[PDB]
Amino acid sequence: ELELDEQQRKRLEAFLTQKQKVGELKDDDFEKISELGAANGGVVFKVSHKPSGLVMARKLIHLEIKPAIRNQIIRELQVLHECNSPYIVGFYGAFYSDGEISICMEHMDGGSLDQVLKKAGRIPEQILGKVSIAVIKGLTYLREKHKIMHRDVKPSNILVNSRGEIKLCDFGVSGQLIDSMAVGTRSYMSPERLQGTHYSVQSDIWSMGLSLVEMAVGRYPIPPPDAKELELMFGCPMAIFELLDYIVNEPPPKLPSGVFSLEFQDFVNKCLIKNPAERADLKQLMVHAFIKRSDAEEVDFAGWLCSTIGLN
Numbered sequence: 001e002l003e004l005d006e007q008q009r010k011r012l013e014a015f016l017t018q019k020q021k022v023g024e025l026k027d028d029d030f031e032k033i034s035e036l037g038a039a040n041g042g043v044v045f046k047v048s049h050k051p052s053g054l055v056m057a058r059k060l061i062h063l064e065i066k067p068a069i070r071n072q073i074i075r076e077l078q079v080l081h082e083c084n085s086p087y088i089v090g091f092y093g094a095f096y097s098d099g100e101i102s103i104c105m106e107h108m109d110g111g112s113l114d115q116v117l118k119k120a121g122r123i124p125e126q127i128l129g130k131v132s133i134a135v136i137k138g139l140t141y142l143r144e145k146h147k148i149m150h151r152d153v154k155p156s157n158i159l160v161n162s163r164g165e166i167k168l169c170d171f172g173v174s175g176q177l178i179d180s181m182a183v184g185t186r187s188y189m190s191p192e193r194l195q196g197t198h199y200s201v202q203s204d205i206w207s208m209g210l211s212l213v214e215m216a217v218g219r220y221p222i223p224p225p226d227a228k229e230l231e232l233m234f235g236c237p238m239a240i241f242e243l244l245d246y247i248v249n250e251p252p253p254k255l256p257s258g259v260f261s262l263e264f265q266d267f268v269n270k271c272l273i274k275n276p277a278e279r280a281d282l283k284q285l286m287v288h289a290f291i292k293r294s295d296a297e298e299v300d301f302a303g304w305l306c307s308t309i310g311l312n
């Protein structure tokens with residue numbers, strides 16, 4: 001499950017070889033190309049690293065803090081140089097300059113799945129099959145190689161590219177950065193995390209299940225759509241506090257019947273069991289009928305993606 005094919009190994013090696021050529025990251029070495037979107041705590045820009053010529057994604061977090069705090073943040077982010085996986089967004093480095101922390105990472109030309117979803121309307125089950133494999137693999141990697149859980153799985157934290165790669169980003173590695181920042185959505189948080197109770201990688205599986213239902217139906221799935229709302233979709237307002245209460249108190253969302261395969265439906269159901277002990281784990285998810293089927297499917301994710309978003 002963590003072993004790599006020839007292509008994956010080669011791309012991972014090529015990234016590291018290019019990264020080695022970049023030295024210390026400095027503010028004045030960046031030329032702004034465009035705005036990629038906004039992440040929690042700051043804006044993400046597509047940039048040119050002038051000396052190396054490398055195109056990067058630069059996230060800028062505005063923080064007015066003492067040299068003590070920022071130097072500790074930068075050191076804590078250094079842990080990202082150790083995360084090397086086809087399912088994790090490549091990291092270049094982090095620095096502080098004139099009231100803002102910069103996190104420089106690999107450019108993903110397909111952007112986030114939250115952006116792809118807006119464009120597509122809804123994402124096909126076979127495409128969600130590849131997405132599920134990449135998320136399980138990224139979460140397994142983080143857990144097994146670094147003893148870390150994501151803590152913030154959502155469609156805006158799943159990045160995609162024209163080579164067909166799917167990678168996770170914005171997993172909390174710096175405690176100090178979270179404290180100083182600290183304000184992202186709690187709408188993908190598991191019922192146990194919202195109840196302050198017992199929380200592990202099982203809470204990330206809930207967030208993945210919820211993100212998958214959202215992408216499949218083309219709508220944040222809580223509260224569930226009524227009989228008339230589903231007819232407009234396939235043919236076949238709640239304030240944040242009300243929503244969080246609904247998650248904790250009500251049955252979990254589910255895919256509509258007779259539109260998706262029973263394997264996909266069962267897969268999301270197992271991710272969405274409210275009790276984390278009963279909820280499927282990464283090991284069980286890796287061998288789920290939906291995962292085994294999707295893994296054997298020869299799905300052109302890059303082709304689908306480029307056609308959908310008008311990339312090219």
Ligand SMILES: C[C@@]1(O)CCN2C(=O)CCc3cccc1c32
Nearest residue numbers: 036037039044057107108111112
């Ligand atoms: C979370 C992130 O900042 C990662 C970088 N990124 C990209 O490379 C593509 C566009 C994008 C949109 C929203 C958030 C991000 C990105």
